[PDB]
Amino acid sequence: APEFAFDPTDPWTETFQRGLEIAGLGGKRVYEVGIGTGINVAFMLQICEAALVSGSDLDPRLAGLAERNVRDLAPRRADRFHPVEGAVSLIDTPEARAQVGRSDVIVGCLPQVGEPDDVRLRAFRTAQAAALAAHYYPWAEFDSYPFNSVGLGLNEALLRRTRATAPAADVVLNFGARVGSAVLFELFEANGYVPEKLHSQIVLQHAGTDISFFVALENALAQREFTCEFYGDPEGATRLSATEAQALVDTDSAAEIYHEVCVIRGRPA
Amino acid sequence: FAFDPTDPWTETFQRGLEIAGLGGKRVYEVGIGTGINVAFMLQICEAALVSGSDLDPRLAGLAERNVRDLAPRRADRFHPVEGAVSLIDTPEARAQVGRSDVIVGCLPQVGEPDDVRLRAFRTAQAAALAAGADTRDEDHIAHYYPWAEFDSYPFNSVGLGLNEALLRRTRATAPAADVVLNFGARVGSAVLFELFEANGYVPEKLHSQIVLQHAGTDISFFVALENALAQTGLEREFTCEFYGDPEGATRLSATEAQALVDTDSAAEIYHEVCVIRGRPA
Amino acid sequence: PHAPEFAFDPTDPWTETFQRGLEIAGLGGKRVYEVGIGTGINVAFMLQICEAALVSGSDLDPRLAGLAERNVRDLAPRRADRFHPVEGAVSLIDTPEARAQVGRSDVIVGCLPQVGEPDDVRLRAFYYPWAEFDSYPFNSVGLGLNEALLRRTRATAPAADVVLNFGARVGSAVLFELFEANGYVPEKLHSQIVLQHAGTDISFFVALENALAQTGLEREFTCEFYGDPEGATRLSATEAQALVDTDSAAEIYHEVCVIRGRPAL
Ligand SMILES: C[S@@+](CC[C@H](N)C(=O)[O-])C[C@H]1O[C@@H](n2cnc3c(N)ncnc32)[C@H](O)[C@@H]1O
Ligand SMILES: C[S@@+](CC[C@H](N)C(=O)[O-])C[C@H]1O[C@@H](n2cnc3c(N)ncnc32)[C@H](O)[C@@H]1O
Ligand SMILES: C[S@@+](CC[C@H](N)C(=O)[O-])C[C@H]1O[C@@H](n2cnc3c(N)ncnc32)[C@H](O)[C@@H]1O
Numbered sequence: 001a002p003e004f005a006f007d008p009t010d011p012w013t014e015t016f017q018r019g020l021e022i023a024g025l026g027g028k029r030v031y032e033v034g035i036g037t038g039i040n041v042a043f044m045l046q047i048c049e050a051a052l053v054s055g056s057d058l059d060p061r062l063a064g065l066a067e068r069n070v071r072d073l074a075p076r077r078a079d080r081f082h083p084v085e086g087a088v089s090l091i092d093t094p095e096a097r098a099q100v101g102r103s104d105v106i107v108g109c110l111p112q113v114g115e116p117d118d119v120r121l122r123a124f125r126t127a128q129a130a131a132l133a134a135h136y137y138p139w140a141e142f143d144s145y146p147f148n149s150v151g152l153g154l155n156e157a158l159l160r161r162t163r164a165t166a167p168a169a170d171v172v173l174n175f176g177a178r179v180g181s182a183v184l185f186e187l188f189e190a191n192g193y194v195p196e197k198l199h200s201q202i203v204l205q206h207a208g209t210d211i212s213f214f215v216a217l218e219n220a221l222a223q224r225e226f227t228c229e230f231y232g233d234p235e236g237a238t239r240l241s242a243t244e245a246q247a248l249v250d251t252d253s254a255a256e257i258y259h260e261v262c263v264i265r266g267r268p269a
Numbered sequence: 270f271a272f273d274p275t276d277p278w279t280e281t282f283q284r285g286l287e288i289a290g291l292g293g294k295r296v297y298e299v300g301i302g303t304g305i306n307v308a309f310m311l312q313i314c315e316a317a318l319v320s321g322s323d324l325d326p327r328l329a330g331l332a333e334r335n336v337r338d339l340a341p342r343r344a345d346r347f348h349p350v351e352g353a354v355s356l357i358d359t360p361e362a363r364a365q366v367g368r369s370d371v372i373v374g375c376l377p378q379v380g381e382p383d384d385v386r387l388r389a390f391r392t393a394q395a396a397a398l399a400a401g402a403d404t405r406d407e408d409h410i411a412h413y414y415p416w417a418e419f420d421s422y423p424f425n426s427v428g429l430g431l432n433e434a435l436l437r438r439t440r441a442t443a444p445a446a447d448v449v450l451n452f453g454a455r456v457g458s459a460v461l462f463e464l465f466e467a468n469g470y471v472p473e474k475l476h477s478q479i480v481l482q483h484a485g486t487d488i489s490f491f492v493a494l495e496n497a498l499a500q501t502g503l504e505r506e507f508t509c510e511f512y513g514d515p516e517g518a519t520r521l522s523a524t525e526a527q528a529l530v531d532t533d534s535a536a537e538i539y540h541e542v543c544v545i546r547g548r549p550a
Numbered sequence: 551p552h553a554p555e556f557a558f559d560p561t562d563p564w565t566e567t568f569q570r571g572l573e574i575a576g577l578g579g580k581r582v583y584e585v586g587i588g589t590g591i592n593v594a595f596m597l598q599i600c601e602a603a604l605v606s607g608s609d610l611d612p613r614l615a616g617l618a619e620r621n622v623r624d625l626a627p628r629r630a631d632r633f634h635p636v637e638g639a640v641s642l643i644d645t646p647e648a649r650a651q652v653g654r655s656d657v658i659v660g661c662l663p664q665v666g667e668p669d670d671v672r673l674r675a676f677y678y679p680w681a682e683f684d685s686y687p688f689n690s691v692g693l694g695l696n697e698a699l700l701r702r703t704r705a706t707a708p709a710a711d712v713v714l715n716f717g718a719r720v721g722s723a724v725l726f727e728l729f730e731a732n733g734y735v736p737e738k739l740h741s742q743i744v745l746q747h748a749g750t751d752i753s754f755f756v757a758l759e760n761a762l763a764q765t766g767l768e769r770e771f772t773c774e775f776y777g778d779p780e781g782a783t784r785l786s787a788t789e790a791q792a793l794v795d796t797d798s799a800a801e802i803y804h805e806v807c808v809i810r811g812r813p814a815l
Contacts, residue, residue: 092466101550113501141505144423144463146685148500157467164469164550182682189644190686190698192705216502226681269653269705358730363814379765416763417771418723421687422731425764434731441733442814490767 005047007039011203012116012261016109016174017043019199019263023105023172025050031100033090033108033158034058036123037130038066040109041081042073053081054099056088058137065130089140090158097165105170106162111139113151114176114259117209147187150179150217159191159266170267172198177260178214178228178242184264193266200262202236207254214242231258270313277480278382278542282375282451283309285476285544289371289449291316297366299356299374299435300324302389303396304332306373307347308339319347320365322354325410331393334400355413356435363442371447372439377414379428380453380540383486424464427456428490436468436547447548449475454541455491455509455523461545470547477543479517484535491523512539557599559591563744564668564806568661568715569595571740571808575657575713577602583652583710585642585660585699586610587635589676590618590625592659597622597629604632606651608640610679617676641679642699643706652706661715662699665692665754666804668747688728690764691720692754700732700811711812713739718805719755719773719787725809734811741807743781748799755787776803 001021007013017040025048032055035041044050057063063083071078088096091106100106111119124135142153155173162171171193175184181197188195205211214228218241230245232238236258240248248255272280283306291314298321301307310316323329329349337344350362357366366372382388386409393408419430432450439448448470452461458474465472482488491509499505511526513519517539521529529536554573559565569592577600584607587593596602609615615635623630636647643652652658663677686694696714703712712734716725722738729736746752755773763769775790777783781803785793793800 092462097471097550113503138506140459141499141507142463143499143505143507144426144460144467146423146687149685151501153500157463160467160469180682182679185644186682186685186698189642190701192701194649213501213503221681221684223680224678269649358726363735367814379767415723417769418727420764420769421690421724421727423687428765430764434727437731437733490765 001047005043011201012109012174012176013040015199015201015203015261016040016263017047018201019174019265020044020048020107020172022198022263023048023107023170023265025105027051028104029054029102031055031091031103031106033106034110035066035083036062037126038062038069038081038083039073040107041066042070042077044107045070045077045080046074051080054084054103056084056086056091056093056096058087058089058139059127060085060087061131062127065127065133068134069130090154091161091165100162100165100169103166103169105172106158106166107172108158109174110158111154112176113213114178116206118206146190150183151213152179152187156187156191159188159193163192163268167268170265172263172265174261174263177262178211178230179217180226180229181262184262188264188266191266192268194269196265196267198263198265200260202231202234202258203261204234205230205257205259209257211242211246211257215246218242229260231260232256234258236260270309276388277478278375278385278451278453279305281476281478281480281542282306282544283313284478285451286310286314286373286449288475289314289373289447289544289546291371293317294370295320295368297321297357297362297369297372299372300376301332301349302328303392304336304339304347304349305392306375307332307349308336308344310373311336311343311346312340317346320350320369322350322352322357322359322362324353324355324413326351326353327407328393331396331400335396338399353413355415356431357438357442366439366442366446369443369446371449372435372443373449374432374435375451376435377431378453379490380455383483423467424460427460427494429456429461429464433464433468436465436470440469440549444549447546449544449546451542451544454543455488455511456494457508457510458541458543461543465545465547468547470549473546473548475544475546477541479512479515479539480542481515481537481539486538488523488527488538492527495523510541512541513537515539517541554599557595562668563742564661564671564715564717565592567740567742567744567806568592568808569599570742571713571715571810572596572659573600574739574808575600575659575711575810577657579603580656581605581654582657582659583607583643583655585658586662587618588614590614590621590633592661593618593633593635594622594625596659597632598626602632604634606634606636606655608636608638608643608645608648610639610641612637612639614676642695643702649706652703652710655707655710657711657713658699658703658707659713660699663695664717666717666719666752669750670747687731688724691724691728691758693720693725693728697728697732700729700734704733704813708733708813709815711810713808713810715806715808718807719752719775720758721772721774722807725807729809729811732811733813735814737810737812739808739810741805743776743779743803744806745779746802746804748794748801750802752787752791752802756791759787774805776805777801779803781805 145153228242773787
């Protein structure tokens with residue numbers, strides 16, 4: 001796969017697309033939870049050579065626009081994109097579940113604590129500008145889930161559904177990794193899946209990003225000590241806890257703070 | 270057959286069961302009590318077979334007599350499981366649940382009517398009197414009705430730990446069976462649906478009714494839900510579903526609801542009760 | 551068929567309880583996997599006393615599989631050929647090798663870390679993964695690591711029994727719910743009253759008694775301690791701390807018990 005194809009403006013999407021390539025979707029039927037404006041669908045179809053891509057989104061206008069972008073960005077593969085229409089939260093319509101049940105791989109880069117602070121505004125404008133062009137939501141809470149203790153409730157809710165509807169399907173998801181890979185792997189093991197980390201990158205966190213959640217979390221987990229994972233350099237050589245990274249920023253407003261993003265595949269037994 | 274407008278929670282449950290499509294099915298009810306729902310499911314719903322159990326060991330025998338009177342024709346077709354059965358936690362109960370197409374229940378939950386235990390007490394001793402026994406006041410279950418072991422459940426945070434506990438058991442023991450449960454909906458329909466989705470079931474709301482909550486009902490539990498933080502310690506949006514009118518047109522938060530009763534202690538406050546069927550994939 | 555009293559561990563009442571439950575479990579002729587093999591004594595016990603057909607297992611520390619192998623060979627030479635440990639640093643069963651073995655096992659067994667374990671077990675002299683299991687619903691009673699194992703055993707070996715050793719200060723209703731919440735029908739195979747080491751911290755259990763329910767909201771809950779060794783006189787966790795306060799050397803007891811979780815099935 002060539003370098004040009006991975007999103008060059010958003011490291012999270014880039015991390016997610018380099019992992020989808022490594023996942024090996026060629027000839028498979030894939031389902032994307034949260035297609036948005038379909039750029040990832042175009043990528044999976046044109047670059048990963050997926051046989052069939054379906055998907056849905058919470059906002060029901062996006063399916064229309066995803067199709068449009070796919071026709072424009074992957075015209076020779078566009079006929080293989082069959083979105084599920086409607087306002088679909090996770091996979092919660094009969095239509096969505098039917099297609100999920102027929103999928104080999106379910107993929108998603110889903111809301112989570114630690115996501116870029118501007119991702120919602122971005123997503124919203126993105127819609128509009130395409131929704132002709134040529135406010136919700138509402139991004140739910142999923143507070144009941146055990147792994148919402150580390151900000152991953154929505155991702156756990158999806159795994160509960162995937163296991164039930166498509167028990168033999170892989171599930172490939174993108175994650176901020178400040179809580180560490182043991183926690184990330186536990187999310188999958190708790191829910192019937194063997195995790196494999198397909199890919200990871202050190203990414204720059206936007207200036208002014210609030211990391212108070214991660215500082216509080218690592219205070220709560222000490223008894224060996226648990227520490228959140230941040231980095232002081234883009235090579236990820238200088239390690240920092242949430243507390244040290246916040247301390248750095250308290251001093252120098254312009255301090256560069258880095259963290260990992262990584263794609264993990266869950267595979268059932 | 271009258272519905273008894275005195276007990277809207279039960280009326281909602283039974284209307285839901287009628288809609289669940291139990292005809293020719295084999296049903297297990299968790300918490301049979303004196304068997305009124307059993308008789309309803311046999312006589313009105315036309316279930317092929319009904320079984321069930323109760324935490325109070327004295328109720329299966331009493332329920333057995335009672336359905337005989339209530340539904341003399343099809344009073345067999347009812348085979349209760351004996352003993353003090355919590356949820357379905359005996360080998361006889363599990364064996365019957367494994368053979369059932371549908372498990373139904375109107376189970377203890379935060380937000381249940383405050384007079385629910387007194388009503389069950391009175392219903393049992395009424396039943397024992399119709400059966401011809403002049404008994405002592407031994408128609409009340411004592412400690413057990415435990416809550417502690419259900420406290421760890423994710424959905425215990427919204428008062429439904431016991432219901433989630435049941436879903437863990439029904440999925441394992443009868444992976445193909447529907448589970449049809451009655452709920453007070455003060456915590457919201459979306460939360461009630463997540464209870465099923467989180468545990469392997471696709472929920473469908475069979476029936477719902479707006480019901481008036483008793484004047485002295487404390488609702489600070491639901492107010493606290495609206496002020497609590499997420500598990501993350503970050504602020505959370507959470508709005509409970511109350512209403513101001515018996516048609517359910519005026520919506521009210523728990524905070525809003527508690528304001529009115531602070532203003533006018535006599536104010537009427539309503540909420541939804543709904544029957545939700547969980548269906549496995 | 552004499553009771554093999556000689557064979558049970560005389561040194562550790564927790565291990566003694568485990569082994570007594572393991573003989574009651576009926577492992578004869580079966581394929582058994584032990585999480586946390588340690589030195590291998592339990593394996594030797596299961597081979598030589600329980601007549602397991604085959605035994606495998608793993609430990610978090612990769613230098614212990616070899617040591618276990620050594621002691622199984624020295625303690626059960628004529629059965630040690632039935633021991634096939636999984637090498638490597640294996641947390642729970644989280645390698646492909648471990649997983650393949652578990653999937654072929656009739657029974658998974660373990661005496662796993664948990665809040666309330668003796669303070670000295672940690673020391674070796676021969677946890678540590680822990681934070682990742684903080685989110686489990688039963689970590690509220692200090693059993694999150696055990697809950698994590700039950701999530702894996704159900705998925706990897708949905709037909710296998712799981713036999714686990716437990717301190718029962720939180721009481722048997724809670725211990726049984728850990729299994730019922732996770733797809734297993736529990737059965738208490740064996741239990742004993744043990745003496746907790748003078749000076750053991752039970753702040754955790756006192757906190758459980760003074761806690762508002764998750765709701766929450768009132769919660770009436772009492773831990774199970776004992777004042778004697780026959781478990782005749784009951785004590786709450788608060789009452790037990792109170793005594794340790796009155797006496798530095800007050801003797802405090804609690805139950806240890808072995809529970810088998812059987813899928814249903
Ligand atoms: C902006 S992305 C999530 C952020 C993530 N950190 C990232 O960079 O990819 C959100 C997309 O997923 C969709 N989405 C959000 N919540 C969803 C849900 N619960 N179910 C399905 N789609 C959802 C949104 O409509 C939007 O198209
Ligand atoms: C307690 S009521 C609840 C009724 C429901 N809230 C309503 O308002 O209509 C239902 C029956 O369940 C029984 N019950 C209570 N706890 C139980 C448990 N853990 N397992 C089984 N049955 C139980 C009670 O004896 C009673 O007979
Ligand atoms: C802490 S000791 C057992 C504590 C237990 N409560 C007791 O009283 O015996 C755990 C044994 O299992 C192993 N072990 C500890 N944590 C483990 C883990 N996360 N996965 C697999 N084995 C583990 C250790 O090497 C040790 O051999």
